[PDB]
Amino acid sequence: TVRTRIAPSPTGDPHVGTAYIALFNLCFARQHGGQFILRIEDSTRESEQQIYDALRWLGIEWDEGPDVGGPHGPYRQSERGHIYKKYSDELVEKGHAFTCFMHLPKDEVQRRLAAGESHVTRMKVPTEGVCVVPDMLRGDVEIPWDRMDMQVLMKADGLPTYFLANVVDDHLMGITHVLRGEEWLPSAPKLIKLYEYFGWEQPQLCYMPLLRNPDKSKLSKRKNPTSITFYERMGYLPQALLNYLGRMGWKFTLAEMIEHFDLSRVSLGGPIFDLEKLSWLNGQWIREQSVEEFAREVQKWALNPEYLMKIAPHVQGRVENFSQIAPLAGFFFSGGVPLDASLFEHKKLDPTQVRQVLQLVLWKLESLRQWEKERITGCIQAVAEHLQLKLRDVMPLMFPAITGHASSVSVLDAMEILGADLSRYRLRQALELLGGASKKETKEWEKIRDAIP
Amino acid sequence: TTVRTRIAPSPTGDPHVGTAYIALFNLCFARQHGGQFILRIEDTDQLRSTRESEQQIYDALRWLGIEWDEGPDVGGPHGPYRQSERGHIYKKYSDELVEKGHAFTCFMHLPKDEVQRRLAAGESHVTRMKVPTEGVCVVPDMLRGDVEIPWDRMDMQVLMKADGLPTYFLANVVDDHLMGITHVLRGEEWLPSAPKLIKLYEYFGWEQPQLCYMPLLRNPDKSKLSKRKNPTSITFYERMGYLPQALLNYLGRMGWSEKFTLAEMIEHFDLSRVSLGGPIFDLEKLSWLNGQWIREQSVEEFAREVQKWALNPEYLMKIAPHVQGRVENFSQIAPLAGFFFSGGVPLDASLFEHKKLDPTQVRQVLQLVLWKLESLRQWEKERITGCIQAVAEHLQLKLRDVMPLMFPAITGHASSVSVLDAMEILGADLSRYRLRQALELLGGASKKETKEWEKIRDAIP
């Protein structure tokens, strides 16, 4: 009986690649009457809920996990006790792993351990030869053992590595097939060797080719936004995006996808993520349904009391009649905003300095986990302070980036209401319009970013 | 689109024929329409719920041939399927009902000041549902059509208990909704309270599922099915050596329209072909049907079923040590140990004339022991012994005064292998059955005797 999983780390917005890998694991388990498992290898509970929300929004679901439960849990690493040290001790007891402070003597080792000196547990990995990874799509892949980096099992803080924990947990959860991105293929020999040290039945392996931009380059937020929630906020239908993830992989529904899913129909070249094709498909989904279904989706997306009432106070003070509301508040519904470079000619900031500020602010807001007004303000203020500018120096740059106008409703409020995705998106588009940042400016300015709270 | 049905058994003791019956219908309706069948454990009563009674539910239903698509034992995308794992979902929804004025805090009247004051002082309280007093509710029953229950009939309704747990009533509405249950088939016992269910869905502004209330299983004398007249526990029929296919088939013949498989039962399943009068549970008809299943199969299938039932190393090696010290040759084993394989035992009232207990006292002892053993969840020797001793102690009798009654009840003989060991091996259902029949033979208990002895029972450990 087939069991697949995803093991996302709860460390930020889920992205399209994660949705993609989840979809394949879901269809594969479904196709074979098996189970699909979500395991959290932890990090914040909030980022965890983001993962659940984004994937469910998409239409993906799982049979076992930390939210729905299951008879093979617990499904968060932080709830699975000392189970990892236990198996790591054994690898050490059988001479398949060693304590590192490398050297060897069990005299000095017991002594150093007794004194509570910091240490890790490393896996022994073959130094000579080639390893054959039996990939389901590619067949036999030959990776030489020499290039195989060293591998930590237990870290200095008595926590397992992602590597160790996933082998342990796949075993304990009876996972039969591991479908993962091909980013993981280089380290596959270390996985195989680990199942050998334990004496465990090794699952079937499948390494999916990477998603690529239309310029045959790897997918990156720089070239096209990757977060699932960005597409939600832009007003894409989850069925369209899910449909699109499937057509890249191997117009249809998830159920129809499962019916006609087969791994053998998957390209060995990296599928292209083409926003124009996705928009066209989404347009088709929008058209091919009743006006009533269309209305409900539009209400859920943005024309609902929760979103509108957040906007209403900021608008009530700035209009002399109701027909002046749409021009003032239209930027809350437009995805991007129309851009005008002249809106960014600062009084006492030169064009390079304007780009510098935008880049730094963008970076800090990209790192910002909790999207709240005070936290948003704190970020921009920290950047300004560190540059010996004042808050009032920087704010005029934020208004046209976020709203398309020199002045508007309170832009800090606007950013909280719009949310993280649309805010970063608009900032990035302003920055790009103005000329972006050279490879050299990126290195310089990142030193500065690092010295900023 | 996509039908989803469920059962929500409380994990409190043996699953019974009734649960099996309601399960079969929900399973068949789901299968007929391409949908899913969900098992949900409502451990709303956390103090009388056990992980072992849950396991007994899974074991008994699966033995019978009933399967589910989602549940605590298998997982599922709308879990957790145990109420006790679903967090403060219920408080959340009960809070909305108060905030939206459909439910009130009850500690009487209600001043906004005096209420906050008492809550802040940690005073005990419940949340109650607002139920209409005048007028009637129309219940859209799939089988009987519109049924009109007067609102005057509705007794008040607690949503959240003082211990912060939901009632079974609020929990199942919340969980049917969150699990997207489309059709609800339950016993007609629940029909009187149906208006409150309808009102609650209205309050949340939720789509009400289709409702169907099934007529009660009855004894052959038109009396509602009870442990009294007929044994109701699934595991009893297993231990008596009935085939689960026959019991399942019989549950289906009672329900709609004598030898059919589950797979066949689903194909020919029509909710419309269900009788509106109580289907009769007739042990003799079930037995004839079970005989036909036993007969219409290979001798090798028959043999394997008998092995699984009782002729296996596990069961026979529990018996072996007790038999070994009591025979001078192997052909004396069968007379001595036959009661391990016979179901009931042959009964002889003269076996119960006690040295120092009069006929009424014998019946009281047997009744009290039976009651306590009916309550026993963990069927183990030390615990069986503790029950009988507690009865004996409380009657100011000695254990050795009560034990002579147990031997003939359990084994059919005055003396035998150790009766306490015999009871553990035989198991809870057969022990209870045998004690009940010994009691019936001796004359049972009057209505008055029952009231009086129950008072005695409740004072016993």
PDB file of N, CA, C and O in Angstrom, chain A residues 30 35 56 61-64 67-71, chain B residues 71-81 85:
ATOM      1  N   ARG A  30      -3.074   8.920  -4.395  1.00  0.00           N
ATOM      2  CA  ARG A  30      -4.471   8.757  -4.791  1.00  0.00           C
ATOM      3  C   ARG A  30      -4.622   7.724  -5.918  1.00  0.00           C
ATOM      4  O   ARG A  30      -5.478   6.837  -5.848  1.00  0.00           O
ATOM      5  N   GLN A  35      -2.068   6.609   0.918  1.00  0.00           N
ATOM      6  CA  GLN A  35      -2.175   7.836   1.724  1.00  0.00           C
ATOM      7  C   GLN A  35      -1.121   8.883   1.380  1.00  0.00           C
ATOM      8  O   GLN A  35       0.036   8.560   1.058  1.00  0.00           O
ATOM      9  N   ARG A  56      -4.403  24.302   1.070  1.00  0.00           N
ATOM     10  CA  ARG A  56      -5.845  24.023   1.028  1.00  0.00           C
ATOM     11  C   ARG A  56      -6.566  24.984   0.098  1.00  0.00           C
ATOM     12  O   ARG A  56      -7.516  24.606  -0.576  1.00  0.00           O
ATOM     13  N   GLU A  61      -5.025  18.449  -0.468  1.00  0.00           N
ATOM     14  CA  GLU A  61      -5.380  17.970   0.868  1.00  0.00           C
ATOM     15  C   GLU A  61      -4.522  16.767   1.245  1.00  0.00           C
ATOM     16  O   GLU A  61      -3.895  16.160   0.383  1.00  0.00           O
ATOM     17  N   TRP A  62      -4.497  16.432   2.534  1.00  0.00           N
ATOM     18  CA  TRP A  62      -3.712  15.310   3.021  1.00  0.00           C
ATOM     19  C   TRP A  62      -4.499  14.453   4.000  1.00  0.00           C
ATOM     20  O   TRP A  62      -5.408  14.919   4.673  1.00  0.00           O
ATOM     21  N   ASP A  63      -4.128  13.184   4.078  1.00  0.00           N
ATOM     22  CA  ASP A  63      -4.839  12.227   4.907  1.00  0.00           C
ATOM     23  C   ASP A  63      -4.368  12.216   6.345  1.00  0.00           C
ATOM     24  O   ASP A  63      -5.141  11.868   7.249  1.00  0.00           O
ATOM     25  N   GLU A  64      -3.098  12.571   6.540  1.00  0.00           N
ATOM     26  CA  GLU A  64      -2.494  12.622   7.857  1.00  0.00           C
ATOM     27  C   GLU A  64      -1.599  13.858   7.953  1.00  0.00           C
ATOM     28  O   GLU A  64      -0.939  14.257   6.978  1.00  0.00           O
ATOM     29  N   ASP A  67      -2.576  19.046  11.511  1.00  0.00           N
ATOM     30  CA  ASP A  67      -3.912  19.595  11.731  1.00  0.00           C
ATOM     31  C   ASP A  67      -5.039  18.541  11.708  1.00  0.00           C
ATOM     32  O   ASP A  67      -5.949  18.608  12.537  1.00  0.00           O
ATOM     33  N   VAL A  68      -4.992  17.576  10.788  1.00  0.00           N
ATOM     34  CA  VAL A  68      -6.075  16.583  10.692  1.00  0.00           C
ATOM     35  C   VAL A  68      -5.812  15.370  11.573  1.00  0.00           C
ATOM     36  O   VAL A  68      -6.697  14.550  11.767  1.00  0.00           O
ATOM     37  N   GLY A  69      -4.598  15.262  12.105  1.00  0.00           N
ATOM     38  CA  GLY A  69      -4.204  14.116  12.900  1.00  0.00           C
ATOM     39  C   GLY A  69      -3.840  12.918  12.049  1.00  0.00           C
ATOM     40  O   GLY A  69      -3.621  13.058  10.854  1.00  0.00           O
ATOM     41  N   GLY A  70      -3.774  11.739  12.668  1.00  0.00           N
ATOM     42  CA  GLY A  70      -3.493  10.485  11.981  1.00  0.00           C
ATOM     43  C   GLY A  70      -3.021   9.391  12.933  1.00  0.00           C
ATOM     44  O   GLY A  70      -2.603   9.669  14.049  1.00  0.00           O
ATOM     45  N   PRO A  71      -3.092   8.130  12.505  1.00  0.00           N
ATOM     46  CA  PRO A  71      -2.683   7.027  13.385  1.00  0.00           C
ATOM     47  C   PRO A  71      -1.198   6.676  13.288  1.00  0.00           C
ATOM     48  O   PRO A  71      -0.779   5.632  13.762  1.00  0.00           O
TER      49      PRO A  71
ATOM     50  N   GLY B  71     -11.583   7.895   9.444  1.00  0.00           N
ATOM     51  CA  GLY B  71     -11.795   7.561  10.839  1.00  0.00           C
ATOM     52  C   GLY B  71     -10.499   7.643  11.613  1.00  0.00           C
ATOM     53  O   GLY B  71      -9.434   7.791  11.012  1.00  0.00           O
ATOM     54  N   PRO B  72     -10.577   7.529  12.951  1.00  0.00           N
ATOM     55  CA  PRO B  72      -9.399   7.690  13.806  1.00  0.00           C
ATOM     56  C   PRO B  72      -8.355   6.631  13.505  1.00  0.00           C
ATOM     57  O   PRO B  72      -7.159   6.912  13.571  1.00  0.00           O
ATOM     58  N   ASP B  73      -8.794   5.426  13.165  1.00  0.00           N
ATOM     59  CA  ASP B  73      -7.838   4.353  12.940  1.00  0.00           C
ATOM     60  C   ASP B  73      -7.188   4.430  11.548  1.00  0.00           C
ATOM     61  O   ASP B  73      -6.092   3.918  11.361  1.00  0.00           O
ATOM     62  N   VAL B  74      -7.812   5.106  10.588  1.00  0.00           N
ATOM     63  CA  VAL B  74      -7.248   5.127   9.236  1.00  0.00           C
ATOM     64  C   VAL B  74      -6.779   6.509   8.800  1.00  0.00           C
ATOM     65  O   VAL B  74      -6.011   6.633   7.844  1.00  0.00           O
ATOM     66  N   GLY B  75      -7.210   7.549   9.501  1.00  0.00           N
ATOM     67  CA  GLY B  75      -6.892   8.899   9.068  1.00  0.00           C
ATOM     68  C   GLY B  75      -7.970   9.439   8.147  1.00  0.00           C
ATOM     69  O   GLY B  75      -9.075   8.879   8.080  1.00  0.00           O
ATOM     70  N   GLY B  76      -7.659  10.529   7.443  1.00  0.00           N
ATOM     71  CA  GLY B  76      -8.632  11.216   6.615  1.00  0.00           C
ATOM     72  C   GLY B  76      -8.436  12.723   6.554  1.00  0.00           C
ATOM     73  O   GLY B  76      -8.031  13.339   7.532  1.00  0.00           O
ATOM     74  N   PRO B  77      -8.743  13.325   5.393  1.00  0.00           N
ATOM     75  CA  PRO B  77      -8.469  14.743   5.140  1.00  0.00           C
ATOM     76  C   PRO B  77      -9.403  15.703   5.877  1.00  0.00           C
ATOM     77  O   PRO B  77      -9.260  16.906   5.748  1.00  0.00           O
ATOM     78  N   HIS B  78     -10.323  15.190   6.675  1.00  0.00           N
ATOM     79  CA  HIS B  78     -11.181  16.071   7.450  1.00  0.00           C
ATOM     80  C   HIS B  78     -11.111  15.732   8.930  1.00  0.00           C
ATOM     81  O   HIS B  78     -12.043  15.991   9.687  1.00  0.00           O
ATOM     82  N   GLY B  79      -9.987  15.159   9.337  1.00  0.00           N
ATOM     83  CA  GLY B  79      -9.779  14.818  10.730  1.00  0.00           C
ATOM     84  C   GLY B  79      -9.488  16.055  11.543  1.00  0.00           C
ATOM     85  O   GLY B  79      -9.490  17.148  10.991  1.00  0.00           O
ATOM     86  N   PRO B  80      -9.233  15.890  12.852  1.00  0.00           N
ATOM     87  CA  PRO B  80      -9.234  14.600  13.567  1.00  0.00           C
ATOM     88  C   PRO B  80     -10.630  13.984  13.696  1.00  0.00           C
ATOM     89  O   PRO B  80     -11.613  14.721  13.671  1.00  0.00           O
ATOM     90  N   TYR B  81     -10.707  12.660  13.817  1.00  0.00           N
ATOM     91  CA  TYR B  81     -11.995  11.975  13.861  1.00  0.00           C
ATOM     92  C   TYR B  81     -12.374  11.545  15.281  1.00  0.00           C
ATOM     93  O   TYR B  81     -13.359  10.830  15.494  1.00  0.00           O
ATOM     94  N   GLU B  85      -9.823  15.391  20.159  1.00  0.00           N
ATOM     95  CA  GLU B  85      -8.621  15.888  19.500  1.00  0.00           C
ATOM     96  C   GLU B  85      -8.897  17.143  18.682  1.00  0.00           C
ATOM     97  O   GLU B  85      -8.010  17.643  17.991  1.00  0.00           O
TER      98      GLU B  85
END
